[PDB]
Every structure is written in structure tokens, then in C-alpha cells.
């Protein structure tokens, strides 16, 4: 019997099969009635759909049907951990899952919510179906490579390394930079479904593919979006959020900055987390 990397059978778990025959674990948060709209939740690197529990519960509370899967190589889905053949696998797999739910709930609007790498995936998802999605919620999305370590030299070097040692990794990224809320850094550090191993060069390069593709997609992007960004984010610099507001052609685009906040705004200090949930609530309410 096919098992998750944690050794639980796929027979017992909500799942789907991708174009490459891999099993992706699925979560659903369905309202009692016929829902107003659908929203797919797109998690980031090293994490999984289960971290979106509170956000999903709140969005179901608004009569939306929330759905998600664990990306290839993440959480309860198959694949070598935090590697991907090409970054477009993540996007293809979101579009597979979206098309399936729309056949089941036709003539409904569909939204995207993405954080970090998941925001990159949300943007590329909407860029490939221009005019299809009703709205996009981005929490500190990946849009921009850190400029000190994205030099002509350090990219070529990365590519040369990839061709010899694709599995070569740097240290684990200091997880203290995720959130000022030390409880949430402790919850991250003790969740068995999170991969905290160092990033491999082959994955490093696919994240640069994502950055390049997001930046080239920004000028042709017209989907409504809410963008939430922390000023002291050491993983996705606040500059990238400003760039998204400059280059996107979307007529309906809103930026909120959280002064002094780190990367995981939905798991930040309660003052920030509550404002984040409230603003996602308000923005989705008005557009449904
Ligand atoms: O709650 C949460 N948030 C998470 C974890 O759990 C943060 C994680 C997530 O998506 N990223 C954080 C790390 C970052 C690395 O970036 C790179 C590294 C090497 C490279 F060569 C090019 C790039 Cl761009 C990408 C985005 C989701």
C-alpha cells in the first residue's frame, strides 16, 4: 500500500495524483451550505497545508470552500524532500487541483492565498490563467532574490555546483527570523511535517527560477490582490512588496505594511496576527 513519507496509508487520507503519478495529500474546510466562492491555500518551502488551519477556519466562516494540498516533496505528499524537477510542477499541480474543484462547484469564483514560496506559486498560477481568478491574498510572497547573494557570480557558481552536487546544502536557515512570536518559532521547530534540513542547490536554483518568472509575470498580472508585508522580514525583503505594487497592472491592489514584523505575519505577535486575519476577512468579505 502507498504510504506518506511518515508511513500512513494514502487510502485513509484525502489525496489526488499529479501529472507525474505522485500522491499529494489534500485538506478541505467546507461550509454547511452551497459556498459563495472557492479559495486554494498555497503553503511555502519546508512547510505544509496544516499550518493554514486557523486561516482556513476563518475563511470557511465566510461561506467559502477552502482547499489545499501539500506541494511535491512537502508535508504528507510524495517526492524527495524540498526538491522539484522544475518549479512549474508546483503551479501545474495547483491548476490541476483548481480545475477539479471548479468542475464540482461550477460558476463559482476562485481565489488564491499564498505565503512566501506559496505566494510565488499563487502569482504564477494567476499569470497562466489571466482574468480567471477573482482575487489573490499574498502574505510576504517570494518575488525577489536577496541582492547580496544574487550577484552574477553567486548565481553562475550555484549553477556550476548544481551540475556536480545538486544535493549539496548550506546550513539550516535561522528559524528565529520567521516570527517575533517565540511560541510560533517553537511550534515550527517541533512540527514533524516541516523540513528544516538545509536548502539544496538544486532547490535553491528552482527558487531563483521562481523569482525570475514572478518578476517577468508582474507587468501582465491583472488579478485583484491584497498584499501584506512585514518591514523587518529577513527572508522576503519589504522592497519586493513595493516592486509588486509598482509593476502589477491590477486595477484592485492594496498593500499593508506591518512595522517591525518578521516573515510569517499570520503567526506573528498577536497585534499583527489579529490585524492580518481581520484584513484578509474584510478584503475577501467585500469581494464575495
Ligand atoms: O511559515 C513558514 N514560512 C516559510 C517556512 O514556514 C518560509 C518558507 C518559504 O517559502 N521561503 C523561505 C525561505 C526562502 C529561501 O529563498 C531562497 C533560498 C536560496 C536560494 F538560492 C534562493 C532563494 Cl529565493 C524561500 C521562501 C515558508
Amino acid at each position: 500500500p502507498r504510504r506518506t513519507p511518515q508511513s500512513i496509508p494514502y487510502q485513509d487520507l484525502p489525496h489526488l495524483v499529479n501529472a507525474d503519478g505522485q500522491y499529494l495529500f489534500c485538506r478541505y474546510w467546507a461550509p454547511t451550505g452551497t459556498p459563495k466562492a472557492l479559495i486554494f491555500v498555497s503553503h511555502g518551502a519546508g512547510e505544509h497545508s496544516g499550518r493554514y488551519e486557523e486561516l482556513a477556519r476563518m475563511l470557511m466562516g465566510l461561506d467559502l470552500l477552502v482547499f489545499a494540498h501539500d506541494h511535491v516533496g512537502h508535508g504528507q505528499s510524495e517526492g524527495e524532500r524540498m526538491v522539484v524537477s522544475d518549479f512549474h510542477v508546483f503551479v501545474r499541480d495547483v491548476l490541476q487541483h483548481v480545475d477539479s474543484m471548479q468542475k464540482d462547484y461550477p460558476g463559482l469564483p476562485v481565489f488564491l492565498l499564498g505565503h512566501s514560496m506559496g505566494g510565488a506559486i499563487a502569482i504564477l498560477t494567476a499569470a497562466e490563467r489571466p482574468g480567471h481568478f477573482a482575487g489573490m491574498v499574498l502574505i510576504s510572497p517570494l518575488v525577489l532574490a536577496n541582492p547580496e547573494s544574487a550577484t552574477t557570480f553567486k548565481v553562475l557558481a550555484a549553477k556550476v555546483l548544481n551540475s556536480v552536487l545538486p544535493n549539496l546544502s548550506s546550513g539550516p536557515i535561522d528559524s528565529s527570523v520567521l516570527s517575533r512570536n517565540k511560541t510560533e518559532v517553537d511550534i515550527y521547530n517541533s512540527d514533524p511535517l516541516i523540513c528544516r534540513a538545509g536548502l539544496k542547490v538544486c532547490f535553491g536554483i528552482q527558487l531563483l527560477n521562481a523569482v525570475s518568472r514572478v518578476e517577468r509575470a508582474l507587468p501582465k498580472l491583472t488579478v485583484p490582490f491584497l498584499l501584506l508585508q512585514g518591514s523587518a522580514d529577513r527572508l522576503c525583503d519589504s522592497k519586493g512588496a513595493y516592486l509588486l505594487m509598482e509593476l502589477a497592472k491590477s486595477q484592485d491592489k492594496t498593500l499593508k505594511i506591518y512595522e517591525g514584523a518578521y516573515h510569517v505575519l499570520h503567526k506573528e505577535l498577536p497585534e499583527v496576527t489579529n490585524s492580518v486575519f481581520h484584513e484578509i476577512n474584510m478584503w475577501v468579505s467585500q469581494r464575495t
Side-chain angles (χ1 to χ4, degrees), residues 1-102 104-147 149-153 155-288:
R2 285 289 262 294
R3 287 158 188 279
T4 70
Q6 302 70 47
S7 296
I8 290 80
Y10 278 112
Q11 174 170 343
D12 299 303
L13 295 174
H15 63 275
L16 65 69
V17 185
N18 70 2
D20 303 326
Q22 299 173 298
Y23 278 64
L24 302 191
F25 167 83
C26 299
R27 273 167 213 281
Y28 300 97
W29 300 261
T32 59
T34 318
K36 291 203 184 196
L38 314 187
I39 183 158
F40 183 86
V41 172
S42 180
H43 72 75
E47 67 157 352
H48 64 100
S49 48
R51 286 177 57 77
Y52 291 85
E53 192 60 45
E54 296 291 317
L55 277 177
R57 283 192 199 183
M58 183 266 283
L59 289 166
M60 190 210 73
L62 305 184
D63 256 327
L64 277 104
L65 201 164
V66 192
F67 64 113
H69 65 249
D70 294 348
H71 302 123
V72 161
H74 291 75
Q76 293 190 78
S77 294
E78 296 185 309
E80 190 185 315
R81 291 296 86 177
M82 295 196 65
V83 308
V84 75
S85 42
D86 182 77
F87 196 85
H88 194 263
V89 166
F90 295 145
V91 178
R92 173 200 75 198
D93 289 355
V94 169
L95 286 174
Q96 188 188 323
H97 201 160
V98 164
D99 294 333
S100 286
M101 290 292 299
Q102 290 220 258
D104 269 335
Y105 298 83
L108 285 194
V110 54
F111 291 76
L112 300 160
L113 187 159
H115 163 59
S116 203
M117 187 189 68
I121 291 157
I123 289 159
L124 294 177
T125 293
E128 189 165 317
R129 306 280 182 89
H132 184 51
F133 294 96
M136 192 162 71
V137 174
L138 301 176
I139 304 168
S140 41
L142 179 61
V143 308
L144 207 70
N146 184 286
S149 35
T151 51
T152 184
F153 167 95
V155 161
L156 181 57
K159 294 188 84 269
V160 170
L161 290 169
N162 185 52
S163 84
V164 176
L165 297 174
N167 292 327
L168 176 63
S169 58
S170 17
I173 291 173
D174 189 2
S175 74
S176 62
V177 307
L178 283 174
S179 180
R180 285 178 301 177
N181 181 335
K182 301 201 298 291
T183 298
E184 284 294 348
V185 177
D186 275 332
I187 288 165
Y188 177 88
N189 278 338
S190 59
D191 184 348
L193 298 175
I194 292 167
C195 179
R196 274 185 309 282
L199 290 168
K200 302 164 159 168
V201 176
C202 59
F203 201 63
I205 282 168
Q206 295 307 322
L207 290 177
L208 293 166
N209 290 344
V211 165
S212 161
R213 293 178 203 176
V214 162
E215 287 168 351
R216 291 194 310 95
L218 290 187
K220 67 188 190 197
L221 189 67
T222 75
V223 66
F225 72 82
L226 175 61
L227 172 59
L228 309 180
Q229 176 70 52
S231 76
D233 185 331
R234 289 179 48 187
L235 292 167
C236 298
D237 186 284
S238 72
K239 282 168 202 155
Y242 296 121
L243 184 66
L244 175 47
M245 296 294 297
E246 291 176 26
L247 292 180
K249 294 292 173 305
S250 317
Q251 294 299 326
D252 173 11
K253 46 172 157 170
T254 308
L255 171 63
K256 224 197 173 73
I257 301 284
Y258 293 87
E259 188 63 21
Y262 295 178
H263 180 58
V264 189
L265 302 175
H266 53 289
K267 296 179 184 306
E268 241 284 340
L269 291 186
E271 293 94 317
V272 168
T273 295
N274 296 337
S275 167
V276 164
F277 275 69
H278 183 251
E279 298 296 334
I280 296 163
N281 185 316
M282 291 299 101
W283 192 91
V284 174
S285 284
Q286 292 183 51
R287 276 158 196 79
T288 63

